Design a protein around this ligand. Structure first.
Ligand SMILES: Nc1ncnc2c1ncn2[C@@H]1O[C@H](COP(=O)(O)OP(=O)(O)OP(=O)(O)O)[C@@H](O)[C@H]1O
Ligand SMILES: Nc1ncnc2c1ncn2[C@@H]1O[C@H](COP(=O)(O)OP(=O)(O)OP(=O)(O)O)[C@@H](O)[C@H]1O
Ligand SMILES: Nc1ncnc2c1ncn2[C@@H]1O[C@H](COP(=O)(O)OP(=O)(O)OP(=O)(O)O)[C@@H](O)[C@H]1O
Ligand SMILES: [K+]
Ligand SMILES: [K+]
Ligand SMILES: [K+]
Lengths: 527, 527, 527
C-alpha cells in the first residue's frame, strides 16, 4: 500500500490542529457549568453524555495527519479512564496545553529527550508534593461531599451513596441497574441471592405471592444431581422423624425423585422444597462449600472424602431460621454455622483475593465476601427514557468510582486549587541545563490550565480568577457555581489525590514523548 | 502483464532519488541527538520508534522506479539487522553515499565490474585494519559503558544489564518482558522454572499464598501417565515408611490415582503433591532425563531399559532440599544429583549445541544450559502505555544485542572515529588501473560520512568536526552530547567491531553491485 | 474476438522496431565489458542478471505488432539456451541483423523462398567450415581458460571447475548449491550419499558429534520392511557369533523389531544400527541391488528368487571397512563386492543410459554411475545476499555448461574471430540465381556483427577493430579486455564449436523464414 510522508513543521502543525480540535470538542463538558454531548448511534437513539473519555473515544477524523494526534489524545483520555475512571477532561486539557506549547516551542537547538527527562523529573516532584499535601478521610459528611461533587452536585445521589456505603461498608459491593420509576431508589440486599427458582409449583405453600415460606428448615447440600429413591428416602425419613421442614439444594432433581417429592408433599403436607444449585463449574462447588460452612452442614458427593447419600445423618444437615423461596430466587436468612469456621473461610477468601487478580475472579470473590459478611447494595436508577437513564447512570458510576478512590487514598483541593498551590514546589528545582529548564518552566505554566478552563466554562475570565486565588491565602478558593471566593474545605469542594496525580503523570509522559516527532508517515487513501 | 522499460541516466536518476528519500527519512533517528519516528498502524495505536531498520522496512513508495532503490536499501538495513541487530543507520548512510556518488560518477569509459572489484579489495583491507585495531573486553565498567551507549545513554539500563550479566554470566539467558509498574526491575531466576501448576487444590498446605511448601521431599519422575493403584501404592508406601514428603512429576494423573492421592492427603496429612510434566514431545523426555541426573533419580517407563513402577526402590527417587509449588509453577531448589554426571550432561549438551544450529533448538539448548548451571534473568520493562513500553524495549533489546556482540568480539572507537582513523590504511593500496583506483578513492571518501552525519544531527558542521578530529592525535575524539573534544576511551564512547565491519561490507557489496545498472524494468500499473 | 489485420511495409516496420528494441535491450550484457540487467519481481527482491536468454524471456511489450517479433526473437534466444545454454546473445545479434536487413531489402522482385534456401545452403557451408576448423581438447590449462572465459574472467571459478573435473572425471556429476559463507568452496563427495538418518538415537556410540562409527560391519539389505522377531533373531545371532558390527538397511523397522534392537544395544553394547532404505518405487530396488553387488551381499524378499530372512547365512551379508552414520546421512566407505560384477553392473547401466533418454532417468543414471565409480562434486556458491548469489550461480552454471560442451566437441577462435575467419569460405559458393546470391551476400555481411558488437560494448569502433583483424594473419586477434591485438591461442580466448554453430543455424533459419511475411493478424485489444 502506497503511503505519504511529511517532514517537520507541517507535520507538527497538522498534529496540533487535530489535538486542538478533539480537545476543544471534549472541553465543553467540564465542570459545574459544563454542558452535555450527544453522539449519533447508527442502530437507534443517540446517547447523551457529559463524559470526557466517552467523547474522546467517540471521535475520529477523516484527515489522516490530524488522526494521529486525535487517536493519541483519545488514548490518553482512555488511559485516564482505565486507571481512575474520572479526571479525564483534566488529563485532556493538560495534554493539549503541553502538546501545543511543545509544538510551538521546538527549535533547531532544543533537545527533546532531555526536555522530556526534565518534564518527568518535575512531574515526579509534583506528585511527591501532592502526596505530602494529602489528608485522610474521616467523616461521612466528607464522603457525601465528594459524592455530590462527582455526581455533578446531585445531593440526592450523594445521600444515597453515603447511605449505601454505611449499610454495606466502605468496601462493599455496589451495582447500578436501570429503574422503572420516576425516582431513584436504594435497595439493600442481605444474605445470599443466587437467582434460582423453585423447581416445582406443587411445593408452594403461601397463597399471597405464591411463595415458599418455611421456618427452622433442614438444609441438604448435594453437589451432584439427586436421582435415586434409595438416595432420597433416608433424608425425608429423618426430616419426618424430627418434624422439621427440609430444603434440598442439589445440582438437579431427576424424574423419579421429583415425582416422589411432589406427590408426598401433595398427599401429606410434608414440608419439603427443592431448588437448583447456583453457579456453574468450580464456582458451583465453591458456593456449595461456602453454604456448608455457613449453615453448619456438609457437602455430599465430593470427590475427596466422598460422603454417601445412603448414610445421611441428622447432624450433616444445616439449620436455617427462615427460608423464603419464590419464582426467581430463594433465601436462607439465619444460618447456624460456627463463627470460627466462618472466620476461617473469610480469611482464606481474602488471602486468595490477595494472591492473584483478574476482573472475573475479583468480581466473584468480592461478591462472595459481601454475601458471607454483609451483603450487597443495588442502586436502581429511574427515568422516563433510556437516554436519560444512561446519562444519569454515567454520572452515578463516576460518583461511585470517585468515592471508592477517596476511600483508598487521601484528598486534595478541588477546582484546580491544589494544582495552583503546587507552583511553589517547582521553584525549588535546579535544572542542570536548558532543556530541563524549559521542561520545568513548561510544567509550571501548564499545571495552571484547569482553573482557567473551569472559569471559562463558567463564563468568567480564568486569568483573573486564578490570579486572585494565587494571591489569596492557601485556604481560600473560588466556588465556580456561586461565583465567589470561599474557604473550599467548609464548602466541601475537594478531590481525590490519585485521579489527579495519575492524569497528570500519564498526560505529561505521553504528550511530552509525542513532542519529539519530526516526521509522520500515513498510508495514501484508497479508492 | 504489460511493463515499462527505461534506459540509463533517467533510470539511475529515479533510483538515486528513491534511495535518497528513504535514507533521509531513516537518518533523523541516528546518534545521541537523533529523534524518534512514529509509524501508522491500521489496527490500533501507532508505534513510536528510533530504529533505523524498523523505519526502513516500514517504508514503501508508490513510484515504481524509486521503489527498486527503496526496497534494496531497506533490504540492506534488514541484512544489517539480520547479522548485527544494530549499526543499521550507519549501513544505510554508507549505502546512500556510495550509491549516490556512483550514480553521479558512472561514465561511458568506466567499467563497473572492475570498479566493484576494487571496492571489494579496499573494503577487505578496511576490515583487516579494523581487526588489527580491535581490543579485548576486560572490565564491567567497559561493558556498562557499551550498554549505556547502545541504550541511548540510559545509565539505569546500563547498570541493570551489567548486574544481569554478572549474575547469569556473560553467556547467560536474558529476556525482555512488559512491566506493569512505573520503574524497570531486574528479576533473577535460579533453578528450574517449567510453568506447570499444582494438579489438585487439596494438596495445598500453606494458607498464606496457597502454596505447597515441603522440605527434603522424594522426587518421582514418570515419563508416562500414572493411572493404576498397583502402580502408585509402592511409592506411597515407601514414602510413608521413610516419613518423607513426595513430589510426583508425571505425564498425567488419572482419575483413580488422583482420587486416592487427594483422599489420603486429606484424611492423614500425607505429604504428597503431583504436577504435570513440562514440555511436549521429545522435549518432555529431555527435561525428564535432565531432572533425573539433577536430582539423582531415575526415569520410569523409558522405551529402552524399561523400569517398572511396580518395583520402585527407595534409591530410584531423587532428593531435593526444598520444593515450592504454586498455581502457576513449581520449584525444586537443592537437588542431590552427583556432580560428575551433572558435568557429563552439561558437556554433552554443549557438544550437541555445537553440532547443528537452528533458532528453536539453540533457544531450547541455551535455556537448558542456564537452567542446569546458573539460571536465567528476566528484565521487566515498565511504563505508562504500550507505545512507551515498546519504544523502550526496542532500545533495551538493541543494548542487549550490543553487549552480547561486545562479548564475542573486541572494541573500536565509537562515533565514527575508528572509521576516520582507518583512512591511512587505504593510502597503502596500489590499484592496477583506473577502475579500482576510482573504487579505492570512493571508499576513502565515503567511509567518513558517519561522523558528518552525527555532527549534523547534533546541529554542528560535520566537516569542521571531522577535520579537527583527523588533525588531532588518535586518542582524541569529539563527544557529540557535550559538544567537546575529548579522549574517547576515558569517556567510554566505544563500539563493537563486528557490527561496523558487517554493515560496511554488506552495504558496500550490495550498493556497489547495484551501481552497475543501465536498464530497469517494472510492470505498468494496473487499473 | 475481433482482430486487426495489417499488410506489407507497415507490418514489417513494426516487426523490425520490436525486434530492434528487444535486441537492443539484450545486447548491453554481452562480452567482457558488458553490464548487468535487473528484472523486477512482483513477490520480492528483483533478480540481477547478465544472461541474454533470461533478459529475452523476461521482456514482453504491450504493442501487439512489436510483440510478434519480440516473442519470436525471445524464442530464438530460448532455443539457443535449450541447446547450448550459452551463446544466446550472439544468436540474438545475428537474428536482429539478418531480420533488419531482410526487412529493408525485400522488394517486389525478390522471392523469399529461394532467398531462404540460399541462406540455408550458405549456413550449412559455414558449419562445415567450422567443423573443419575445430581442434580437440588436450590440456587442463585449456579447460581452465574456457571456464574462465565462460565465468566472465573469474580465475577462482575457473580453477575450482578445473579441480572438480580432475577429481570427478570429465563426465562426472557437478551440482551448484547456495553457500552460507563469503567465499566459494569446492566439496568432494565420494562413495554413496543417500540422505537417510539413523532411526533411533539409542544407536549413537560417538559422543563428539552424535555419530555412529563402526568398523568392519556386516551389511543387511532388506527390500521389504523388517517386522518379526523370527525374521530378525538369526541375523543378530550370526553377528554376535562372529563378533562384528551390523548395519541393517531396510524399507522400514516395525515397533517390535525396533524395540528389541534398541533394548539389546542399550543392555549389551551390541554393535547394531538400522537406517531407512533410500529412494522410492523401483528406484529403491535399483539402489538396493546396486548396494548388493557393491558390498557382495544379497537382497532379501525379492519377488523373483525370493530369499527368506529366516534362513539368512553369513555369506549373504555384505562387508564394509568403515561406516559413518549421522542425523542426516549414512556412509559405507569400503565395500567388498567383486570387481567383475561391479564392472558388469557399470556396463549394463551405461547401456541402459544409451538406449532411452529423458531428463529424470538420465539424471538418476548419471548419479548412480558417479556413486558407483568415482563420486560426485558439489560447488557451494557463497555470498552476502540472495541476489548476489543468484547472479554468480548464473555465471557458474554457464561456465559448467561451456566446459561440458568443450568436452564433447572441439574449439574455435573466440571473440568472433572464428566467424571473421569464415568469410573466405563463402567466396567459393556459386549461386544459381539472384535470390540465393542475395542470401549468400547477406550471410557474408551479417556473420561479422558479433565482433563489432563486442568492440562497441568495449567502447571502441568495431569497424576499425574488425578491419585490422581481418587484415592481420589468422593467428592474431584482438583482446577486448586489454584493448590490444594479440595471438588469441596463447591468451586462451577460445570458444566451443557447438554453441556458435547451433546459434548461427537456429537464428538464421528462424529469422530468414520470418523475413517471408507480408501480412500480420492480431486480436483487437479487449476492454
Ligand atoms: N462548584 C464548583 N466550584 C469549584 N470547582 C468545582 C465546582 N464543581 C466542580 N468543580 C471542579 O471541576 C473539576 C472536575 O470537573 P470535571 O469532572 O468536568 O473534569 P474531569 O473529571 O476531567 O472530566 P470526566 O468526569 O469526564 O473525567 C474538579 O476539580 C472540581 O473541584
Ligand atoms: N555522545 C556521543 N558522542 C559521540 N558519539 C556518539 C555519542 N553517542 C553516540 N555516538 C555514536 O552514534 C553512533 C551510533 O548511532 P545510532 O545507534 O543512531 O546508529 P545505528 O546503530 O546505525 O542505528 P540503529 O541502532 O537503528 O542500527 C555510534 O558510533 C556512537 O559512538
Ligand atoms: N577479453 C576478451 N577479448 C576478446 N573476446 C572476448 C573477451 N572476453 C569475452 N570475449 C568474447 O565474448 C563472447 C561471448 O560474450 P557473451 O557470453 O556475453 O555472449 P553470449 O554467449 O551470446 O551471451 P549468453 O552467455 O547470455 O548466452 C565470446 O566470443 C568471447 O570470445
Ligand atoms: K467532564
Ligand atoms: K539509529
Ligand atoms: K551475454
Amino acid at each position: 500500500y502506497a503511503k505519504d510522508v511529511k517532514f517537520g513543521a507541517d507535520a507538527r502543525a497538522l498534529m496540533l490542529q487535530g489535538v486542538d480540535l478533539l480537545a476543544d470538542a471534549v472541553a465543553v463538558t467540564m465542570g459545574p457549568k459544563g454542558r452535555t454531548v450527544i453522539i449519533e448511534q447508527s442502530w437507534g437513539s443517540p446517547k447523551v453524555t457529559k463524559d470526557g473519555v466517552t467523547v474522546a473515544k467517540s471521535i475520529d477524523l477523516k484527515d489522516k495527519y490530524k488522526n494521529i494526534g486525535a487517536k493519541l489524545v483519545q488514548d490518553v483520555a482512555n488511559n485516564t479512564n482505565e486507571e481512575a475512571g474520572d479526571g479525564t477532561t483534566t488529563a485532556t486539557v493538560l495534554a493539549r496545553s503541553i502538546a501545543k506549547e511543545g509544538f510551538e516551542k521546538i527549535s533547531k537547538g532544543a533537545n527533546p529527550v532531555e526536555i522530556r527527562r526534565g518534564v518527568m523529573l518535575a512531574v515526579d516532584a509534583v506528585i511527591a508534593e501532592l502526596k505530602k499535601q494529602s489528608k485522610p478521610v474521616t467523616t461521612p459528611e466528607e464522603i457525601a461531599q465528594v459524592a455530590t461533587i462527582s455526581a455533578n452536585g446531585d445531593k440526592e445521589i450523594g445521600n444515597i451513596i453515603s447511605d449505601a456505603m454505611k449499610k454495606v461498608g466502605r468496601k462493599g459491593v455496589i451495582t447500578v441497574k436501570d429503574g422503572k420509576t420516576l425516582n431513584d431508589e436504594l435497595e439493600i440486599i442481605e444474605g445470599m441471592k443466587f437467582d434460582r427458582g423453585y423447581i416445582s409449583p406443587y411445593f408452594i405453600n403461601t397463597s399471597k405471592g405464591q411463595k415458599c415460606e418455611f421456618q427452622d428448615a433442614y438444609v441438604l447440600l448435594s453437589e451432584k444431581k439427586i436421582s435415586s429413591i434409595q438416595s432420597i428416602v433416608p433424608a425425608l425419613e429423618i426430616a419426618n422423624a424430627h418434624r422439621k421442614p427440609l430444603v434440598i439444594i442439589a445440582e438437579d432433581v431427576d424424574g423419579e425423585a421429583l415425582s416422589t417429592l411432589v406427590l408426598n408433599r401433595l398427599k401429606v403436607g410434608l414440608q419439603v422444597v427443592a431448588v437448583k444449585a447456583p453457579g456453574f463449574g468450580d464456582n458451583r462447588k465453591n458456593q456449595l462449600k461456602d453454604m456448608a460452612i455457613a449453615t453448619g452442614g456438609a457437602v455430599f458427593g465430593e470427590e475427596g472424602l466422598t460422603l454417601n447419600l445412603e448414610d445421611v445423618q441428622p447432624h450433616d444437615l444445616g439449620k436455617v431460621g427462615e427460608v423464603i423461596v419464590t419464582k426467581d430466587d430463594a433465601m436462607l436468612l439465619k444460618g447456624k454455622g460456627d463463627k470460627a469456621q466462618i472466620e476461617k473461610r473469610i480469611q482464606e477468601i481474602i488471602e486468595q483475593l490477595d494472591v492473584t487478580t483478574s476482573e472475573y475472579e475479583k468480581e466473584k470473590l468480592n461478591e462472595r465476601l459481601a454475601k458471607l459478611s454483609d451483603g450487597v447494595a443495588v442502586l436502581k436508577v429511574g427515568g422516563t427514557s433510556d437516554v436519560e437513564v444512561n446519562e444519569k447512570k454515567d454520572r452515578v458510576t463516576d460518583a461511585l468510582n470517585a468515592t471508592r478512590a477517596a476511600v483508598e487514598e487521601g484528598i486534595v483541593l478541588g477546582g484546580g486549587c491544589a494544582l495552583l498551590r503546587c507552583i511553589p514546589a517547582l521553584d525549588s528545582l535546579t535544572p542542570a541545563n536548558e532543556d530541563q529548564k524549559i521542561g520545568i518552566e513548561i510544567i509550571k505554566r501548564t499545571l495552571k490550565i484547569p482553573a482557567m478552563t473551569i472559569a471559562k466554562n463558567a463564563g468568567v475570565e480564568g486569568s483573573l480568577i486564578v490570579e486572585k486565588i494565587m494571591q489569596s491565602s492557601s485556604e481560600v478558593g473560588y466556588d465556580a457555581m456561586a461565583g465567589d471566593f470561599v474557604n473550599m474545605v467548609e464548602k466541601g469542594i475537594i478531590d481525590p489525590t490519585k485521579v489527579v496525580r495519575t492524569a497528570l503523570l500519564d498526560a505529561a509522559g505521553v504528550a511530552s514523548l509525542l513532542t519529539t516527532a519530526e516526521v509522520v508517515v500515513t498510508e495514501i487513501p484508497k479508492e
